[PDB]
Amino acid sequence: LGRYQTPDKKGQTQIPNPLLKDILRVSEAEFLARTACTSVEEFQVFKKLLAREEEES
Amino acid sequence: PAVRLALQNFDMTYSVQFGDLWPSIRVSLLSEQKYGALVNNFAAWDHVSAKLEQLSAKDFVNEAISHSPASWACSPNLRCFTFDRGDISRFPPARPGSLGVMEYYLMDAASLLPVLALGLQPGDIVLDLCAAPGGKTLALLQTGCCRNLAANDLSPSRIARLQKILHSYVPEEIRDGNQVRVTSWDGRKWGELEGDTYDRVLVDVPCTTDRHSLHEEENNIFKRSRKKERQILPVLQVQLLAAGLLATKPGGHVVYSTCSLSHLQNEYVVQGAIELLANQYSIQVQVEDLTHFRRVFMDTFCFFSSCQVGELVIPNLMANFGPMYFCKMRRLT
Amino acid sequence: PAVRLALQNFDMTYSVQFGDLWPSIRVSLLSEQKYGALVNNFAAWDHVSAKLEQLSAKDFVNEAISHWELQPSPASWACSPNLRCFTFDRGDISRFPPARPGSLGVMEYYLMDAASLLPVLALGLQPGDIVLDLCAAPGGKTLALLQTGCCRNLAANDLSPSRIARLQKILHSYVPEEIRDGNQVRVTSWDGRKWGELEGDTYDRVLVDVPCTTDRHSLHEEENNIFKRSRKKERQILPVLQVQLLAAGLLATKPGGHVVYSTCSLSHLQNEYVVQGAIELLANQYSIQVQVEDLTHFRRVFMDTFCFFSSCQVGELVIPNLMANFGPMYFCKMRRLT
Amino acid sequence: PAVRLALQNFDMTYSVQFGDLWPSIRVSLLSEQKYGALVNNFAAWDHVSAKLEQLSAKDFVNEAISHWELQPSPASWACSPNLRCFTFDRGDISRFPPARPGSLGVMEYYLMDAASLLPVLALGLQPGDIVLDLCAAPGGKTLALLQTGCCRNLAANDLSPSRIARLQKILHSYVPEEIRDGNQVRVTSWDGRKWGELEGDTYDRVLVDVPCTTDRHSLHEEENNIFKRSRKKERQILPVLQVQLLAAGLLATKPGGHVVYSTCSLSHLQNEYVVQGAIELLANQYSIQVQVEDLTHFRRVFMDTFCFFSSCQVGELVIPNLMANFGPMYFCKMRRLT
Amino acid sequence: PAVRLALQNFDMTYSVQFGDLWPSIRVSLLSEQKYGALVNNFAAWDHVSAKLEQLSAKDFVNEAISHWELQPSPASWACSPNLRCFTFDRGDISRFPPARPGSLGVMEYYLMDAASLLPVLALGLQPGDIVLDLCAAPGGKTLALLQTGCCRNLAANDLSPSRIARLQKILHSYVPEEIRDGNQVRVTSWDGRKWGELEGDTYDRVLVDVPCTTDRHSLHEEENNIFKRSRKKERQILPVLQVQLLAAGLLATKPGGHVVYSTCSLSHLQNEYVVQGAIELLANQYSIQVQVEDLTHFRRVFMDTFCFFSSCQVGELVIPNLMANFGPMYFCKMRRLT
Ligand SMILES: C[S@@+](CC[C@H](N)C(=O)[O-])C[C@H]1O[C@@H](n2cnc3c(N)ncnc32)[C@H](O)[C@@H]1O
């Protein structure tokens, strides 16, 4: 989505990434409403697409 | 690297164009795309249609046509199956049917919309100015409306792929003789050769192929060496669209299309080619409204409705149909 | 060391000025500051406003304008419009998350000291004004001046070309290319004191947010600290420069136009002494009359969000407090008459 | 040429609209117009009124108000007060001499098309109203809005800074310095279409006297003629601009507030379709309900002085006639509900 | 002979270009030219201005700026400031007396073709600009660029070291040692065409006042005449050099920066052809986009003093007329985008 940048080489990003607790600790509904900012239906499809990507190799 | 330069360029350009809609597009471009199975009418379509329905797929064209008054124009006999909204199932590879020709052609379902929007009528003289590898050429043939179909492409290597598709999908009875003509020449020169000849013209121009440019590293337009070629791309596109319009009969129609989200390659090329013909050749070209067409096909695709000229299908995870810009025109004078 | 010299200097001066109020200020300057989220009107402000309300934050500017009628003219006639700045409640120490790009690839909001918006609000921009931000970098107040949608033209100036790069970064991040490349905005890097000669009697509104001892920043950053032993002369001659810049701002103002002078220092030698000093210099040397305008109604309306040192003779002063830790912000509105 | 293109266009369009009434209008547009002397209340109106009565002229606004009871609410509750405008009798072609400064320096009266006062009268200013004149220059109707003594605040706006100079000239000529420089009047020069964003839901009364094909003026002046071959696009897109300005006026109006839209054109395209268009645009795009108010009693009362085209569906229209040669003047009162 | 070949060539070429306008130009080129007195701001301009007003001369840059509002941005934003140039009225043929050293031993004013100031004015210098005069000698326009007080840095270049001596003479005669002997003014005598390589993307403003057929001078002076039989190749390849110098100027300009190209020739081959040629060369060879900026408002404002050939596609052209005998002066403003 572009809402999480990988830090490197000095451990710095253009925009600061969301806090680990706001990504993982929080509910799927709050994650999507405040952090990811996408619909519920869209993430359900993402989970299925990613599951298949992992299954192959 | 070129894949990262492509995404880097998209982040700069497309975050501005789509705003808060860009993330939903970005994730879709970086995920698996959705395909539609264009049924081959030469291979007994009724059995193929029935076979594809067993997978829970549905002909989106049949769904679209059933639905607004029948004022809008649309190319017929195109049956293209897709899975439901949110379904990520994949079609198995097509196989040769009982007549030795392939049952269906897998493709981006959105690639059928410029062909549909072009509105082929029975007995039309049709031109596909940048035809290779032949996905849209194949669809133009499937309509059964082409009296004559000119398929052109500058690259003789991509024309081999077009010939492979024609041999794989079209019976020799329909390829030869005078119904199909495959040429390999500069499309920009069509104003001089074959001017005012065609009823319908498809100008599916070479562009930055946004989705493909994020997957394939070989022959990537965003490579450092291909900087000039990429920057002069809107010049070429206008030159090809203007040539398409000059080969169109007065009163005839043209569909311009790209597989890019860039406004520089989409609307600005339509706006540019219309000006060039009005000033240099004194030919008037009217952009036709595809709002009814859009509204009817919105059930299957995500459109960026803020489009001034033409229409744009944007990729979304619910319907991951790649960037597809298209604009219908009528040459008046 | 320079951080300790700054605090040492503030203990000597500000204990005398504020008296028994100085400790409450001292603890606030040595603790985390409170920020406000200035909404970007180019980035679809309605969605950003709604998103910021989910955090329990509230637009202090709207709250203020609502009570403009309570205790002469509409708020829009007195106070610069369309500025939406969200802050958390009094006593709340929550932090806003970093802004991200939105509606036109522009950043949704700009985090800043909420008090920094008050000189811009107090300046009272009206539709179609020719505006000048004489000491504009890094661009926080420049950004707010643009957000009003009143600037026919906006001149942003700063002597430092390095700080102008930061101003250009903010304009590229927050403003679409349509506005920042046109004749609506002009970024220059020149001595602001020379504006009396070049561009005299030109601007309707002028902001003179002068370089000062940046009291809060001087206690945090050791690099480029004004209280360093080598910068002793530079710091002592600072009220001369501040008068020179304010006088230049007034000379670039049209007769009848208005100017807001501001600092982020508690020192009276940089605040009231500069306003009086520039008004005298223009009356003696140029025979130009300058009237200080009363911001008591403006203060009273904004007192609900900020702590003001009400004992100000000319202008107004926001003092930092733990309940509302909005850094030192001095500001004075003036009208050039002749 | 442009004068002939204007007449050519009006022969095509207005022979169809008015039918057998068009000749009586055509001859009136091509003959000398009738003026009214709007008395200046700041210049001791009682002496000016007495002076103007010596010429055999009579205040048509007073004559109208007298018959307000004949054929719901006092005239002052419906119709903007303290406007004294003298005209000669029906059929009289006498001209008023030029106005002169009085004992107070301000000019005694302002000569104008008497019909231009009707949109201001119809707007129904009440004491203490916040008023906006969105397309104010050169200031004839602005001047009348001030004369009522009802404006708490009066915003006068016009995109052209050159026509604003003429508005400032009129304000300096007729209005005392005490009023014109205070917080009671504010002259701006900015696009009126942007008032929805800046200063929304602010005004009690709003006048939107839009730029139009100025039918009478376009048949006299060849310079800056809207019917010039070069100004073909500008003239065709004129109803878009007119809706944009009216919609902006309505967005600037408080819910419950009132707006008068007006033109000095006879075309249905610039009159009723602009009113209907702007009402639709606000209902669809902003979900704001706007009600057209009936001015039949207002018309009937003022019919004694002006010729009205009574077949008007929305609003009212004063048509020029040789007996009362008061130029085309379309006007429609509206109330913003939500 | 070379003077007759120049006129012979102009009769062939310019009778076709201007048509029935060529005689009025021809008589003006063969008669005494009109001069303007550019006031020296370093030599107390207020006394010089007052002294020049006694002769019945008037500052045309001020007259022009006054009408900048009539018929977007302040004049200072669009047009280079602090340039005071006095000329006699339209039709007056009076001559200014020679300039004398004044207060600080510097020359009071510089006599020149008033039109030569227009490319400098049109270039629109803003405070703090890095400026380049690629073909600066003998220094008339260099002097004007300095007079603005906007140049952070001014690069003055000319291939001829003999004409650079004249430029140094003017700088010593008009500019005090404090400025000329500093990092503000840099005089070089290198090839201007090589500026793309050395000092690329460096300047905010660039003046490319190229060597041309100097139409008026070529009809007076027989020595060093471009129309001599031996200089046939040099004269024919002149549009190549001109494009090479303009392209070099554009390559030295920062992206977003502006360039003014100018000549003192009526020949379209040296004017518009060179502008299109350099824009094409940059687009094809370097993939740099260059936009010609419209100077119609600039022209319209200065039309009161000069005769312009309004049929100019790109740029503007001042044509000599007996009423205002200001020599051929072509000029075109550009913006480098990429
Ligand atoms: C997007 S592809 C067309 C896709 C095709 N219509 C399909 O649906 O399978 C664009 C094509 O333009 C071709 N092309 C590039 N320059 C050309 C030119 N000057 N004239 C004609 N074709 C050209 C490329 O070789 C490329 O095959």
Ligand SMILES: C[S@@+](CC[C@H](N)C(=O)[O-])C[C@H]1O[C@@H](n2cnc3c(N)ncnc32)[C@H](O)[C@@H]1O
């Ligand atoms: C407090 S900062 C302005 C803050 C800015 N208005 C904002 O809100 O982001 C004061 C500025 O004055 C600038 N400055 C110092 N001397 C100057 C001068 N002579 N002319 C103009 N600016 C000057 C400094 O570079 C510094 O950026």
Ligand SMILES: C[S@@+](CC[C@H](N)C(=O)[O-])C[C@H]1O[C@@H](n2cnc3c(N)ncnc32)[C@H](O)[C@@H]1O
């Ligand atoms: C009919 S005049 C107003 C007459 C004025 N109310 C009077 O009675 O003296 C219409 C005005 O609209 C102004 N105008 C045009 N476009 C405008 C815009 N976008 N915003 C505001 N005023 C505009 C014109 O400059 C013109 O003065």
Ligand SMILES: C[S@@+](CC[C@H](N)C(=O)[O-])C[C@H]1O[C@@H](n2cnc3c(N)ncnc32)[C@H](O)[C@@H]1O
């Ligand atoms: C018209 S003059 C400049 C007039 C000057 N700007 C003024 O206003 O006084 C043109 C100049 O171009 C110079 N020149 C010729 N070739 C050149 C080159 N390659 N590079 C730089 N200057 C050159 C000539 O020596 C001549 O002085």
